[PDB]
Design a protein around this ligand. Structure first.
Ligand SMILES: [Ca+2]
Ligand SMILES: [Ca+2]
Ligand SMILES: [Ca+2]
Ligand SMILES: [Ca+2]
Ligand SMILES: [Ca+2]
Length: 309
């Protein structure tokens, strides 16, 4: 059923061209705030743990999270598909992690800021209620900084949740990074393509760029890109079964949230801030130098670099 059980981006983040399966993430929840997720997909069913809808007339709506788009299923599979109970499916970065499928985007792929904020806060409240470590993964954003979403991100970060979000797809001009990725308390993820330039993976032209003034110090301020990860031509799970290939910072984001889950599950006593630092140091050790604006060191195209296993 799968054309590639181990897509290029999984091999790249694992730094193993002959990887046959992935591992890790046990006990970490990845809250995928998106268009929903296909709950019966063979390669996700073993990890579905929560399924809630934030787009309806009351909120949350429990035991409802249906994906009619594909984007949310696809993102989920990159983070944590497990190969299925027959091992014949695809693998994501952290196949032992738990999925919290929170539908915050309408079937069109667009979502309202109040709904997104509500889901960010609910993920945090569920982390606190359950006593379990949680990563919010947001393959979404806007050029504008909504204060409902910002305040929700702060709330979650204060409850010990890690927030990972897409940089956006408005590149490659300076200053195109969107929100919530551009928030100080969110890890903004740039997209790599499977091309080498200057001896490294290349940032995709579409990937939104941060700002010159605050790049270079390996300290995240508002507007800074943080992690790069595979985003172009990514094969993953799809909403009606099956698989599909789509591109974007949306695809890069779950590589990072899955990596973060894999790292946290190893090292499960880390705070969110310590986990964040571990991810930053991984990235720093793999400097990205390809693509417009990319440079030696921390830069506004690729952030600190490409965090790998
Ligand atoms: Ca759990
Ligand atoms: Ca609403
Ligand atoms: Ca940020
Ligand atoms: Ca900075
Ligand atoms: Ca660089």
């Amino acid at each position: 059923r799968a054309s590639q059980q181990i897509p290029w981006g999984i091999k790249a983040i694992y730094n193993n061209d002959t990887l046959t399966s992935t591992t890790g993430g046990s006990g970490i929840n990845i809250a995928v705030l998106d268009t929903g997720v296909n709950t019966s997909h063979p390669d996700l069913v073993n990890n579905v743990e929560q399924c809630k809808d934030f787009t309806g007339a009351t909120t949350p709506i429990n035991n409802s999270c249906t994906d009619r788009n594909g984007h949310g299923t696809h993102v989920a599979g990159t983070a944590l598909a497990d190969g299925g109970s027959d091992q014949a499916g695809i693998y994501g970065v952290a196949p032992d992690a738990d999925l919290w499928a929170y539908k915050v985007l309408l079937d069109s792929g667009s979502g309202y800021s109040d709904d997104i904020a509500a889901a960010i806060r609910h993920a945090a409240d569920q982390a606190t209620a359950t006593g379990t470590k949680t990563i919010i993964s947001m393959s979404l954003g806007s050029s504008a900084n909504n204060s409902l979403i910002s305040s929700a991100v702060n709330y979650a970060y204060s409850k010990g949740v890690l927030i990972v979000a897409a940089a956006g797809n408005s590149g490659y001009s300076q200053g195109t990074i969107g929100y919530p990725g551009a928030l100080p308390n969110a890890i903004a993820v740039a997209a790599l393509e499977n091309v080498q330039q200057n001896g490294t993976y290349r940032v995709a032209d579409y990937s939104s760029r941060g700002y010159i003034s605050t790049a270079g110090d390996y300290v995240i301020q508002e507007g800074d890109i943080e992690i790069s990860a595979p985003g172009s031509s990514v094969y993953s799970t799809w909403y009606n079964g099956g698989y599909n290939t789509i591109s974007g910072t949306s695809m890069a984001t779950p590589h990072v949230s899955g990596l973060a889950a894999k790292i946290w599950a190893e090292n499960p006593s880390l705070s969110n801030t310590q986990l964040r630092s571990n991810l930053q140091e991984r990235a720093k050790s793999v400097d990205i130098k390809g693509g417009y604006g990319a440079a030696i060191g921390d830069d506004y195209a690729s952030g600190f670099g490409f965090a790998r296993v």
